[PDB]
Amino acid sequence: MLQIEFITDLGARVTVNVEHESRLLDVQRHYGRLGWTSGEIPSGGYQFPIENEADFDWSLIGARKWKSPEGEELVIHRGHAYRRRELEAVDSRKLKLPAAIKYSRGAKVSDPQHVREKADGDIEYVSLAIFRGGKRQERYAVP
Amino acid sequence: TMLQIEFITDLGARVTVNVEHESRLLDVQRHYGRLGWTSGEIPSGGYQFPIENEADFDWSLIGARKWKSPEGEELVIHRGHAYRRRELEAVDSRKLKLPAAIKYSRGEYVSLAIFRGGKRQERYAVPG
Amino acid sequence: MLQIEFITDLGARVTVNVEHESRLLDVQRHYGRLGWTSGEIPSGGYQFPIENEADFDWSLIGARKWKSPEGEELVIHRGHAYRRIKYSRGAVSLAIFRGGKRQERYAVP
Amino acid sequence: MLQIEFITDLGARVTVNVEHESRLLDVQRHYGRLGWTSGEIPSGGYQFPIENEADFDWSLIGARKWLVIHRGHAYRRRELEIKYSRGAKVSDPQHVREEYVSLAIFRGGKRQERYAVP
Amino acid sequence: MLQIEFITDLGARVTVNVEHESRLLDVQRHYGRLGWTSGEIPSGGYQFPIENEADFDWSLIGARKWKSPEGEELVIHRGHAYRRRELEAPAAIKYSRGAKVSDPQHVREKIEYVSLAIFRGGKRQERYAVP
DNA sequence: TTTT
DNA sequence: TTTT
C-alpha cells in the first residue's frame, strides 16, 4: 500500500493511494497524462537510457510532446517549453561519456538557483531530461 | 481508492481533506475554495487559462472570489488580496508574438491569473 | 475525517485527526491555547476585519493577549511579543485589523 | 489520533503514530533517545525556563549529554548573569549564525515538570 | 506502525508503510538499492565512523559503489558521482563531487567540493555495514 | 486540447 | 548496461 504526492495542473497538492507498488508507474502515467507531476525535476534533469529517447512516454513525468509549425518537436512540462538538443561525447582523462540527447530551455528570472545549470561555451539553462548510455528499459516506453 | 487534498484555510491552517474519487476533486476545490481556502501556490506569472474561459471562470477553483461593482468594476479577491482586471492587446514585435489577453494582477506587484489563447475547457467554468 | 498540521510549542511537527469539519475551529482553539501554530504568518501579517479586533480569539493563531494594568496591550506568538489596528514588532506584523465584514466564528466564544 | 514527523539520525523522513495527546512528549523522548529530531531549531535556539536547566530531559529534542550532542554537533554550557551553543562551521547557513549558533537558551519562565527527566 | 517518505528513482514523492521500527533499516536498504532516497544530505555530508568505511552499506542512503573505467572508486547517488578521498591529519575519508552553480554556498567545501559522506572517528556501528 |  |  503506497501513497504518492502530486501537484495537479491547477497546482493543487493532492495525494493518491496506490494498491500495490507494481502499479506505481501506471499511476504516474495516469495522472501525468493530465499534466500532474510528482516531485521536482532532479538535478540536471531526469536521466534515462539513450535507447529510451525516441519512444519515451512523456506522460510519465507529466509532460507532453507537441510538434510546432515549421516542423519542431517540443516538450511541454508545467507550462514550459523544452527543446531537443544534442550533446557531444566527452573526451579527456579522466572522464569519457558517450553523446547525449538533452531536453532543455533557457533559465528565466523566476527560476530558482537550484534548478539552473551552467556549462562552458554557453549560458545557463534548465534541463528536463538527459538521454545518455545505459540500457533500454520497457517501463519508460509508450505502451 | 480515496484521494486527499491539502489546503491552506482562511486562518492559514494546514488542512487535509478526503475525496472519494478524482471525479469529485474539482467539486471539493470549489467547495473549500468558496471558503477562501487554497491548495498549492500561484505559479510564477500567474495561473494560465484559455481566453475563452475568462467570462464565466469559476474563481472558487483557486479559492478566489469575483466581485463586480454597480459600476461594472471587476475585482477578484484571493487570500485577502484584491486583484484588478486589465485587458491587454496583442503584441507583434521583434521578440514577441503575443495574442490578446486579460490579466488579473495587483500592485508589491503580482499577477494571479492570465487568460490568453488556448482552447476553452468546460470544467473551468461556473457549473450549471 | 480531516487532518490539521501543527508546529507544537517544542517545534515538533504533529498532525491531529479531526472527526468532523464543524469542529475544526474548536481543535484549533484547543491546540492554539498551548502555543501550537498551523502554517505560517502571511506576508504583511494576518488580515482580519477591524470589527473583529476587540474580542479576537488569538488562540486561533496560537497566540495569547497580554494587558498590563498599567495600560499596555501585547500579543505573544511563538515566543515573540507584538506591540499594539496593527500588531507588529521589530525584526514585521503578526496580524492587521482593517475594514472587512465582521465574522462571528473568529471571536472568543 | 496523532502523528509525529521525525528526521531520523540517518536523515530519513519518518512518521510515527501516537495514542493520545498526553503520550506525545514520551514518544518524543523515545525516538529522541535514538537521535531523531522533529522540526527545526527556532532562531536563537529553543527557549526554556532557567529552573528547567537542572534536570532537563535532552531526549525531548533528540539531544544527548556526553557537552551536549544534537544532530552530530557538540554544544557547550555557558553561564550568563544557561545558553548552549557552538562555533559556526562552514556548512552552517547564514541564518542561525548568531559568529556562533545556539541550540538552547535557558532564561526566565516557570519550571514546567514535563520538560525535566521523569 | 511507521511510515517513511521516499523520493523514487524517478523523482516521485512516495510514502511506504513499515510494520515495526526494527525493520526500518531493512526497508531503507530495500528501496535504497533501487536508488530511492529519504530526506536530504546533511551539509558536510552524512557522518559515519571511519571503521564503517570499508564495508559501509551504501544502499542505506540510496547509493551504490562503482569502479569506473579510469579505475577510480565512485559512489553514485541521485545520478551524481562522488569520488573517494583519503585525508590525513584528524584523518578522514570523504566522498565528494565538484560544486555546481545550483549548489548553495553553505554546501560547498574548500576548488570547491560538495560531500556525500564523511568517515571519521567515532565507534564502528554494525548496522551501517553490509549485512 | 493545449503548445514558451 | 554507470558519472562531470
Author numbering:
A (entry chain A): 1 to 143
B (entry chain E): 0 to 106, 124 to 144
C (entry chain D): 1 to 84, 101 to 107, 126 to 143
D (entry chain C): 1 to 66, 74 to 88, 101 to 117, 124 to 143
E (entry chain B): 1 to 89, 98 to 118, 123 to 143
Task: Pull verbatim passages from the article behind this deposition.
The crystal structure of DdrB confirmed that in addition to be being functionally dissimilar to canonical SSB, DdrB is structurally distinct and likely does not bind ssDNA in the same way as SSB, as it lacks an OB-fold. SSA appears to function independently of RecA and is thought to play a role early during DSB repair in Deinococcus spp., particularly when the number of strand breakages is extensive. It has been suggested that DdrB may play an important role in SSA due to its ssDNA annealing activity, similar to Rad52 in the analogous eukaryotic pathway.
We report the X-ray structure of DdrB in complex with ssDNA to 2.3 Å and assessed the DNA binding activity of a number of point mutants generated based on this structure by fluorescence polarization. Molecular replacement produced a good quality electron density map for the entire asymmetric unit (one DdrBDr pentamer) with very clear density for bound ssDNA in two clefts formed between three DdrB subunits. The coordinates for this model have been deposited with two individual 4-mers of dT bound between subunits E/A (T1–T4) and A/B (T5–T8); however, when crystallographic symmetry is applied, the two 4-mers form a continuous 8-mer related by the symmetry operation [−Y, X–Y, Z + 2/3]. Although there are five channels formed between adjacent monomers within a single pentamer, only two are occupied by DNA. The regions joining β6–β7 and β7–β8 (Lβ7–β8), which were unstructured in the apo model, are stabilized through interactions with ssDNA and are now visible in the electron density. The β6′–β7′ hairpin is involved in direct interactions with ssDNA in the DNA-bound structure, as well as playing a key role in mediating the oligomeric assembly observed within the crystal lattice. Overall, the interactions between DdrB and the bound ssDNA consist largely of charged interactions with the phosphate backbone, and interactions with the planar surfaces of the nucleobases. W66 in particular is involved in stabilizing three nucleobases (T3, T6 and T7) through both face–face and T-shaped π–π interactions. Dimerization of DdrB pentamers is therefore required to generate the DNA binding channel occupied within the crystal structure.
